Amino acid sequence: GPSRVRQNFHPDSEAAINRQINLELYASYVYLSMAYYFSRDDVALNNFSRYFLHQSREETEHAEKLMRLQNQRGGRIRLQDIKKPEQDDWESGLHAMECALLLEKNVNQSLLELHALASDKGDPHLCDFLETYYLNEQVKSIKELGDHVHNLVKMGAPDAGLAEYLFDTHTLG
Amino acid sequence: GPSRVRQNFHPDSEAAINRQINLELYASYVYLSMAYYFSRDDVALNNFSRYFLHQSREETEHAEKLMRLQNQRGGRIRLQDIKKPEQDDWESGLHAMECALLLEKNVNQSLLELHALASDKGDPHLCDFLETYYLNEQVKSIKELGDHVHNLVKMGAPDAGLAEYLFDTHTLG
Amino acid sequence: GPSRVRQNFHPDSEAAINRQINLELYASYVYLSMAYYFSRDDVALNNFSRYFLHQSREETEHAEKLMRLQNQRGGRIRLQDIKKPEQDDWESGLHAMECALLLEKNVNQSLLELHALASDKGDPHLCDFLETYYLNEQVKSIKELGDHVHNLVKMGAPDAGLAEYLFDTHTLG
Amino acid sequence: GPSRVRQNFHPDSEAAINRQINLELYASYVYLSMAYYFSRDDVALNNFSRYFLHQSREETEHAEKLMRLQNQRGGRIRLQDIKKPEQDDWESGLHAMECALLLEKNVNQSLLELHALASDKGDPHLCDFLETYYLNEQVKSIKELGDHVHNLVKMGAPDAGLAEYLFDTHTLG
Amino acid sequence: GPSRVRQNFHPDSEAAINRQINLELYASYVYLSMAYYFSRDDVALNNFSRYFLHQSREETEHAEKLMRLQNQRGGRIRLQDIKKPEQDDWESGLHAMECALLLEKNVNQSLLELHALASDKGDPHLCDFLETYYLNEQVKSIKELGDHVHNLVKMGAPDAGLAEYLFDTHTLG
Amino acid sequence: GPSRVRQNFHPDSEAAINRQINLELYASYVYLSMAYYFSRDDVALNNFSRYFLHQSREETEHAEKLMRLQNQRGGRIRLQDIKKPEQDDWESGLHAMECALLLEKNVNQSLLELHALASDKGDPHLCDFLETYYLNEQVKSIKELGDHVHNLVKMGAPDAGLAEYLFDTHTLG
Ligand SMILES: [Cl-]
Ligand SMILES: [Cl-]
Ligand SMILES: [Cl-]
Ligand SMILES: [Cl-]
Ligand SMILES: [Cl-]
Ligand SMILES: [Cl-]
Ligand SMILES: [Cl-]
Ligand SMILES: [Cl-]
Ligand SMILES: [Cl-]
Ligand SMILES: [Cl-]
Ligand SMILES: [Cl-]
Ligand SMILES: [Cl-]
Ligand SMILES: [Cl-]
Ligand SMILES: [Cl-]
Ligand SMILES: [Cl-]
Ligand SMILES: [Cl-]
Ligand SMILES: [Cl-]
Ligand SMILES: [Cl-]
Ligand SMILES: [Cl-]
Ligand SMILES: [Cl-]
Ligand SMILES: [Cl-]
Ligand SMILES: [Cl-]
Ligand SMILES: [Cl-]
Ligand SMILES: [Cl-]
Ligand SMILES: [Cl-]
Ligand SMILES: [Cl-]
Ligand SMILES: [Cl-]
Ligand SMILES: [Cl-]
Ligand SMILES: [Cl-]
Ligand SMILES: [Cl-]
Ligand SMILES: [Cl-]
Ligand SMILES: [Cl-]
Ligand SMILES: [Cl-]
Ligand SMILES: [Fe+2]
Ligand SMILES: [Fe+2]
Ligand SMILES: [Fe+2]
Ligand SMILES: [Fe+2]
Ligand SMILES: [Fe+2]
Ligand SMILES: [Fe+2]
Ligand SMILES: [Fe+2]
Ligand SMILES: [Fe+2]
Ligand SMILES: [Fe+2]
Ligand SMILES: [Fe+2]
Ligand SMILES: [Fe+2]
Ligand SMILES: [Fe+2]
Ligand SMILES: [Fe+2]
Ligand SMILES: [Fe+2]
Ligand SMILES: [Fe+2]
Ligand SMILES: [Fe+2]
Ligand SMILES: [Fe+2]
Ligand SMILES: [Fe+2]
Ligand SMILES: [Fe+2]
Ligand SMILES: [Fe+2]
Ligand SMILES: [Fe+2]
Ligand SMILES: [Fe+2]
Ligand SMILES: [Fe+2]
Ligand SMILES: [Fe+2]
Ligand SMILES: [Fe+2]
Ligand SMILES: [Fe+2]
Ligand SMILES: [Fe+2]
Ligand SMILES: [Fe+2]
Ligand SMILES: [Fe+2]
Ligand SMILES: [Fe+2]
Ligand SMILES: [Fe+2]
Ligand SMILES: [Fe+2]
Ligand SMILES: [Fe+2]
Ligand SMILES: [Fe+2]
Ligand SMILES: [Fe+2]
Ligand SMILES: [Fe+2]
Ligand SMILES: [Fe+2]
Ligand SMILES: [Fe+2]
Ligand SMILES: [Fe+2]
Ligand SMILES: [Fe+2]
Ligand SMILES: [Fe+2]
Ligand SMILES: [Fe+2]
Ligand SMILES: [Fe+2]
Ligand SMILES: [Fe+2]
Ligand SMILES: [Fe+2]
Ligand SMILES: [Fe+2]
Ligand SMILES: [Fe+2]
Ligand SMILES: [Fe+2]
Ligand SMILES: [Fe+2]
Ligand SMILES: [Mg+2]
Ligand SMILES: [Mg+2]
Ligand SMILES: [Mg+2]
Ligand SMILES: [Mg+2]
Ligand SMILES: [Mg+2]
Ligand SMILES: [Mg+2]
Ligand SMILES: [Mg+2]
Ligand SMILES: [Mg+2]
Ligand SMILES: [Mg+2]
Ligand SMILES: [Mg+2]
Ligand SMILES: [Mg+2]
Ligand SMILES: [Mg+2]
Ligand SMILES: [Mg+2]
Ligand SMILES: [Mg+2]
Ligand SMILES: [Mg+2]
Ligand SMILES: [Mg+2]
Ligand SMILES: [Mg+2]
Ligand SMILES: [Mg+2]
């Protein structure tokens, strides 16, 4: 138009926010896939299921806050296909945790690149938005997943018969 | 394996449930797109936004109940890409309502075909599942959208300046 | 003295904060003028009046937080005349909303320049202060005013006899 | 128009009310300046600060009641620049109290002149308004400031090191 | 390893965080020393004691939040000796306040250098951490100590017999 | 002076109390180090972390009660550097427990020597202070750590993958 609200909002930032929306929705879909893997009759780790379902819902929240930001700043949301996850069968509780850790690091890297772009374009509102709602959340998530991976490895997952069962009930319970 | 739980569950039913999961997730994405269209600064119909956001969340619930059914019956969830909606700019409150009505009829037709398949395969559990949780929900949704379309048309949407504003505040408020 | 508290606080930042204080007080005065325009017997839109009176009080808060910052950092407040608003008769609810939107964008631009100055002077405390309390508040205010302008335009304000009356009662009520 | 509400309201009264509005806003600004003087790190008398901030807010109330009166009687508010206070550095708690006393007497004199004008123009509504809301308030304010000045003088302010500190905590606390 | 959680975290930042941990623990020890100075039988200013004990506990909190950050980011905490304070006998309430002010400015300078390092290394998570939890806290602490120093100087501390006694009971009480 | 409060308080006792203060602060620092070892991403035993953090806070309390005693008896606190712990990486939950047990025995021995000194100097107040607040606390702490070491050894820590995990959740939880 430009939008009557738009101010100090670079087209490159608008496009990068659209890409980030897609990535957050993708992460939501990965965790939804994991949640329902753990409720298979031949897996049946209900607290792993609940843990990943919660993570899925959080990622949808992350996508929505970026969609709201786009509108607030006068950009236009452009949605793209949400790609299916890389797997349907996630192999084990440990493997799912390791894949989640890799996913979160990848999302973090994208957010850091978005922050660098916002800095380059002199957009302190966008920088603050990412710092306030995204960057520390990512650090906490990565740390949590790292803790979980360590405990599962030490306990002898996936092959030690009691490991994932006991972690399911005592850590994720 | 087959799954140690699987009984009277035809592979064609399992595949059709996977297709229905994708369609429910697609419908969820369409309504999410609509929700954020109505919160654009140049649209700003907050109760249309809230209405479609609620519909989006309901469709995710519909997808999840089918995913649970797949696990309950011993089938294996196979996720596919969630296609982007046909539009980002939904034009008006009336146009969004008309598109939602068409979407719901299309989803209904898919559910009726799923029911016919389940009947052909002598799967009364699957027939009952669809009747109990899907078919009446669809009829109620289609009727509601039909009511909304009629009122918006009669009020003179989209061109009559007061129509969508007043419908937003008095029907969807 | 310098102040026994002063540290990493550039004289240019101190002066720019004094200018921003004046601009926030000016904005408060503009909105006070608008508030009392809407309570004229020949205007009588009481919820427009209340809306702008609230905005006026918020701007005084914005001025006071900067005055507090000046003291906290060891700068010295230097007040200047508060210029009268550009108009006493604000013409219509739509015109007042459009003028408020322009005012908020102008204040935003001043805040962005203040942030750039603070960045240039390596003052992260001042940068954070602006990000935490000012920049997102401005984005939200501009978006809100944009929403209001759009609805009033679409409804046919100012000439459509029902438009401002109905917006007063249903949006600002 | 004249206003369809206007009755027995002389143009000279309308103009004098506009002048009084400006004077009340000026007094509000003087007291805001004083409030933030007392929160300087090299002054730090927090109850003097709170006392003057309260007085500032009361003066804005006084301005608003006159603005409301203008509208009630069918006059038209005409705002003018709010002049900056005569000082930024108010020297001491005693000096600020003495300046406040002088300010209140000056405002009182203006109100008495307004009352004499209203009497001359046979406007008993305006006379009653001033008597009901302004004249006794002024007498109480002047008396309070006189009490405070006397105690601070007797205690040995500003040079006696304990005087303003102890008055801050025990009278204004 | 590197740590499986580590991302965008420069070794220089990790080392600087270890140095800051030591400095916060040092500040905690200085304030603990001051707290117990004021409870000597020949000093006996119990509210000065309580004030510095509270400051001591806050500094331990500051150290712990940095230790947590180190773990969150995948760095490794490296503790060093906590040096004893420069004095055991802090001379007077005024002298302790002046020493605390100098200490807080020194800690602030270290935090500003840490922020500049984090900026140089493109670590927005670390920048935000310092802005959110440290930089404004320091500004508030320095301002508070400046206020206290001013009042004690004006009251005639340390030699005026009533000054520290009255400040203890009325400001710190 | 001597202190006007000092009575039956030998200079050797005063010096020994200063040494004990340092040792209690050292023990506090050892346990703080252990607490944050257990929250590393590659250790992640949160109840070991909480257990040692609590022990750290208790040791600071032990130091403060001796500092208070020094003042109560008219002695003068003389603080010294707090040496860093012997390790940053505490190897395992069992190793940390074994090191804590050794530390507590060492502190106990110092307290017994202090008691023998107080007895030699005919200071029954000091003897009672140590008996009332220190000696039984030490016996309880040593016994608790001995219990924990035994269970961890029997369970097969540190190499048995489930041992420290299960002890963390069921004993320290
Ligand atoms: Cl722009
Ligand atoms: Cl795509
Ligand atoms: Cl920037
Ligand atoms: Cl864990
Ligand atoms: Cl590991
Ligand atoms: Cl167990
Ligand atoms: Cl079957
Ligand atoms: Cl596809
Ligand atoms: Cl059947
Ligand atoms: Cl309807
Ligand atoms: Cl129709
Ligand atoms: Cl209506
Ligand atoms: Cl400076
Ligand atoms: Cl000017
Ligand atoms: Cl900076
Ligand atoms: Cl609106
Ligand atoms: Cl528009
Ligand atoms: Cl008249
Ligand atoms: Cl003027
Ligand atoms: Cl009269
Ligand atoms: Cl008085
Ligand atoms: Cl007098
Ligand atoms: Cl007193
Ligand atoms: Cl790294
Ligand atoms: Cl050292
Ligand atoms: Cl950065
Ligand atoms: Cl103070
Ligand atoms: Cl001073
Ligand atoms: Cl003695
Ligand atoms: Cl030493
Ligand atoms: Cl004895
Ligand atoms: Cl035990
Ligand atoms: Cl044993
Ligand atoms: Fe999470
Ligand atoms: Fe959550
Ligand atoms: Fe996310
Ligand atoms: Fe694909
Ligand atoms: Fe794997
Ligand atoms: Fe995530
Ligand atoms: Fe920044
Ligand atoms: Fe921030
Ligand atoms: Fe997360
Ligand atoms: Fe619905
Ligand atoms: Fe619903
Ligand atoms: Fe559906
Ligand atoms: Fe496509
Ligand atoms: Fe259409
Ligand atoms: Fe539907
Ligand atoms: Fe529905
Ligand atoms: Fe209505
Ligand atoms: Fe506002
Ligand atoms: Fe507000
Ligand atoms: Fe503002
Ligand atoms: Fe002018
Ligand atoms: Fe206009
Ligand atoms: Fe504003
Ligand atoms: Fe605002
Ligand atoms: Fe007053
Ligand atoms: Fe009052
Ligand atoms: Fe007044
Ligand atoms: Fe002037
Ligand atoms: Fe004076
Ligand atoms: Fe007054
Ligand atoms: Fe008054
Ligand atoms: Fe007193
Ligand atoms: Fe503090
Ligand atoms: Fe505190
Ligand atoms: Fe600190
Ligand atoms: Fe030394
Ligand atoms: Fe000194
Ligand atoms: Fe500090
Ligand atoms: Fe502090
Ligand atoms: Fe203990
Ligand atoms: Fe305890
Ligand atoms: Fe101890
Ligand atoms: Fe050493
Ligand atoms: Fe060992
Ligand atoms: Fe101990
Ligand atoms: Fe004894
Ligand atoms: Fe005893
Ligand atoms: Fe203990
Ligand atoms: Fe258990
Ligand atoms: Mg326009
Ligand atoms: Mg992508
Ligand atoms: Mg479940
Ligand atoms: Mg079998
Ligand atoms: Mg399909
Ligand atoms: Mg909304
Ligand atoms: Mg000095
Ligand atoms: Mg200006
Ligand atoms: Mg009103
Ligand atoms: Mg007429
Ligand atoms: Mg005047
Ligand atoms: Mg104050
Ligand atoms: Mg690995
Ligand atoms: Mg150092
Ligand atoms: Mg005490
Ligand atoms: Mg004597
Ligand atoms: Mg020693
Ligand atoms: Mg913990």
Describe the protein in words.
- With 173 residues, chain A is mainly alpha-helical.
- Chain A has one domain: Up-down Bundle (Ferritin).
- Helix content of chain A is 71%, strand content 0%.
- Chain A has 5 helices and no strands.
- In chain A, helix 3 packs antiparallel against helix 4.
- The first copy, chain A, is elongated.
- The N and C termini of chain A lie far apart (52 Å).
- The relative contact order of chain A is 0.15.
- The structure holds chloride ion (33 copies), fe (ii) ion (FE2) (49 copies) and magnesium ion (18 copies).
- Residues 80-81 of chain B line the site of one chloride ion.
Oligomeric composition of the shown chains = part of a larger assembly
Structural class of chain A: mainly alpha
Q: Which H/E pattern describes the elements of chain A? A: HHHHH
Question: Which CATH class of chain A is shown?
Answer: Mainly Alpha
Keywords:
6 chains; mainly alpha; Ferritin; elongated; binds chloride ion; binds fe (ii) ion; binds magnesium ion
In terms of topology, how is this protein built?
The structure is cut from a larger assembly and holds six copies of chain A (173 residues).
Chain A: H1 11-37, H2 46-73, H3 93-120, H4 124-155, H5 163-170
Helix pairs in contact in A: 1-2, 1-3, 3-4
Bound molecules: chloride ion (33 copies), fe (ii) ion (FE2) (49 copies) and magnesium ion (18 copies).
One chloride ion (CL) binds next to loops of chain D.
Subunit structure (chains A, B, C, D, E, F): Homooligomer of 24 subunits. The functional molecule is roughly spherical and contains a central cavity into which the polymeric mineral iron core is deposited.
EC number (chains A, B, C, D, E, F): 1.16.3.1
Family (chains A, B, C, D, E, F): Belongs to the ferritin family.
